[PDB]
Amino acid sequence: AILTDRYINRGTAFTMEERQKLHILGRLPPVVETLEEQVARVYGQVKKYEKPINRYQHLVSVHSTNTTLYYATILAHLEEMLPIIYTPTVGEACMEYSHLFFRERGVYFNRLYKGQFRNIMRDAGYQKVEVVVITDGSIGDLGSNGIGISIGKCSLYVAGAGIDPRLIVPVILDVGTNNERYLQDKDYLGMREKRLGDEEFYELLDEFMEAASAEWPNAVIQFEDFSNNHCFDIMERYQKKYRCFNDDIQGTGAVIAAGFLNAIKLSGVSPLQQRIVVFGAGSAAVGVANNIAALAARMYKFPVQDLVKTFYLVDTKGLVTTTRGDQLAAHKKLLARTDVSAEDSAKLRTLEEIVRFVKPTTLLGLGGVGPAFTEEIVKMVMQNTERPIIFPLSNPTSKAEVTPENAYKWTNGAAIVASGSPFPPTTIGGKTFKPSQGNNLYVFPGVGLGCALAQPTHIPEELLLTASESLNLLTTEGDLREGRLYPPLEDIHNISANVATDVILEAQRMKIDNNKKLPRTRDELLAFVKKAMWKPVYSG
Amino acid sequence: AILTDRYINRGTAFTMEERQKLHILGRLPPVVETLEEQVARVYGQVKKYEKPINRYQHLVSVHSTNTTLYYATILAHLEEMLPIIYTPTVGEACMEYSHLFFRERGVYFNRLYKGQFRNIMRDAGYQKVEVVVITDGSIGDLGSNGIGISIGKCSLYVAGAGIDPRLIVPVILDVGTNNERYLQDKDYLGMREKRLGDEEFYELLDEFMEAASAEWPNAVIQFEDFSNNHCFDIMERYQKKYRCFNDDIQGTGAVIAAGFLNAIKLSGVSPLQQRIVVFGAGSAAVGVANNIAALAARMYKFPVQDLVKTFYLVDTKGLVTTTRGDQLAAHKKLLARTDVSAEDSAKLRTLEEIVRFVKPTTLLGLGGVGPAFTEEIVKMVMQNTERPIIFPLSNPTSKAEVTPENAYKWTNGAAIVASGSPFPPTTIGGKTFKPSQGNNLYVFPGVGLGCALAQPTHIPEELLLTASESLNLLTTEGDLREGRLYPPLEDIHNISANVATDVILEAQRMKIDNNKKLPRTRDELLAFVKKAMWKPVYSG
Ligand SMILES: O=C(Nc1cc(S(=O)(=O)Nc2ccc(OC(F)(F)F)cc2)ccc1Cl)c1cc(F)cc(F)c1
């Protein structure tokens, strides 16, 4: 009842004297290890597997046996482990190996349980739940297998911000699937029917949000991996009534904005002198641009309309302008050029000719349509600025606008680069360069830990902008001198504690915080936040 | 506390009504399956992995979650699953992937715990223990990683004979290792020292046997995978004082003997007309020959000395005779030819010239030294008998004296073949042939179930000979007409119940049985044995 409890089990870290006292002498091999030694052993066990999915499989079995050792291993090898325990391995595990999630505590909803959502939550037997990750499996369709996405995401809040692993709930809202293989698969365990229409979808998701605010009143609700037809609408429906956010939309823009403002500082080319091609004009790409404007307005008090005019949006038609003669979608209107002639708009269609005309100092890659930041385009940006900022942010790694290596080569080390995925360093004439990864892990854990402590009535856009600024300000003079746009990913606990502290102070300034126990001054609150965090060490 | 208990967990086999009553509605995807459907799903999950070791890894995680479903899957796919859940996959898992055994309940002994063996057994918290598999990791050296061999073997008693999975204990006696990689491996968790000398070895193994006979008085002790320097000596030390047997020695000879006597019936060439080359003359090979003689004497009441003269033993020097002029090891003397001249012995060195001289009707491959049953040798056996019996029994599959395919081809379908490993069928002129696998699973489970029910004071050689005869007599007229030497492996529960019944009746005839509750007549006892067996079905 010690060994079989994954929360108190220590395996070989039980001293001989503990083994005797606990009457488990002879249930373990004789070597006594420290946690650090166990982690090094587990690390070698992981690298004994070649395929990511088999590495993940090993780590799931570590989590089932000794949960402390699982988190200790992830934190000691975070950069290397991240692509294994979340994107892109996790989607492939959900799609083909969904059995790897069967043993993980989670909650399955569907229309069959309509009206009983609250009783299912009560029966799940949770104490003071702090974070809930919900998906529908729809940003191929995984349907019910989307539970794996919620599981993987919950685990990053535990690793990243020390959310206690017993106070986090992964949730699948199964509203059906349009995945035709699943609909015909004898082994699919979900609702075998096409996705429900919006009316029934919102009836079930409304019951979910009401039931959770009642049974899990202390929880942050985070939407993960919802398709475009619903993710924006979901936040508009719930942002004010419940304590919720969407990491794909709000986390991404918060992280990119923080890294982008640090790239502006290293460029010496100040924010109002920037000329920014935003390659890709979906709602998310436009959200990222707005988040950059909002952070620059907060950090530097330039008029936001002056920041908005640094942006040149490119959709599939070309430069978005008011004179190009089409009916612009609402999200594109605010960043539309007003200073470009109909005649010039007609000659502003390919990225090459847009770059030649605009003379940008920055390229933001949000296009999702492969490697458009050509050698020729990068060479042009080099005649407008001594430090081109190039952000190939499209995932997966195949969709990326340019490789950091190509960016560094073509600019002979002058490009300031942030990526969506990890990349190895590139060395040019004895000088080393490495892109700064804009990982979402920098923001969501801190937001979840801040909202878990402050208990705000809701998560207004101010708390996300605060987290964005906090992340920006954590990049030290030393980090900046070495070309880093973000604090180091390995220091995620310190990053999360700082982001959480600043999110709390913001909720206090807005008087939406419901926890009166917290300190209200930054130094004392930061110290308090750090002590509240769950640590993967053997405590008792 | 339902889902997390692998003994009562049913997963998707919980009906909706059970889920509601058990307050686990919403802890599972919505599909309700029968056990049979779960097994077919698990089977497809297994075949999603290419490597045996990754298949085993998946099955270990099935056992951890839903133990009923694990055993249901093995029994539905026994022939295919056996090479994955025991030899040869299990040795490779122990050697390189020993972490796959960490979550399995077992007991580790070593010299550090000297004098406390009994308290470790008490503390392990077992009820009426029926079977104990012990190894030292020495038949490469795995040392402590040998625990995986005990684990794999315990699981075959549960699958094969319905030993209740809560009443079986896997044991490693770690007396050190001579594996030099392990002695230098930072991740080895065993005693980091060379194997103990015989005096300290027997002090620890004597304490083991005394402690077990006291704390686990109802148990069968089975020795598994002990090296030749100790396995024979161990049985001589303990056979009369404790309830114990060695499956490598006694199980192998019992299974081979049963299959061999069935091969004699199909050959029509009766036992006293057989001429049997025994290729390989180690203690085990000579044990197999003696077990064949002993079974033929029991089943047919030929004088045993007349059976002994059907055997022609070949060691590395050639035909073992009294005239060949060397000092014969004790085990070889009893099967030594007395009817071969010194002059003929000098010309009886290669297997080819021994086969030409002896004119055997049978070749028994126990040599462990590769494919010595050549096309030329098989062609010669064809001029001495219309049905050559050819038994390439050397493991692994590389050491085998001849492929069943080659045997069937060279004899145009006349060879009667038993193998150590599974082989696919061979088709010759529209006629199908398939070797009968002499798997050890045919005997050890039945012996363990018989000795668990009868509670004999010890396991004399009569009980093994009884099990051997019982297995022989289970091969039906129909099995025999189709060329099978053994009952079908898939019917292992019925085989185990029959072997157990006959072992019990033998212990009753000898008045060594200590359980007075049992029926004493075969039909009533067989019915009773079948009802006692643990079944992998959802019971409650
Ligand atoms: O804790 C148990 N055993 C154990 C633990 C360790 S450890 O030090 O905690 N490292 C460790 C663990 C698990 C892992 O992952 C795995 F299981 F996949 F290999 C990797 C690395 C080392 C050796 C052993 Cl034998 C145990 C737990 C039970 F619920 C039941 C039971 F019978 C034994």
Ligand SMILES: O=C(Nc1cc(S(=O)(=O)Nc2ccc(OC(F)(F)F)cc2)ccc1Cl)c1cc(F)cc(F)c1
């Ligand atoms: O029993 C649980 N879940 C579950 C079981 C099944 S099943 O029907 O029992 N098939 C099944 C199981 C396990 C396996 O092996 C594995 F885990 F490796 F995939 C394969 C096949 C299907 C779906 C699910 Cl979600 C469970 C158990 C816990 F201790 C904790 C917990 F949160 C959930």
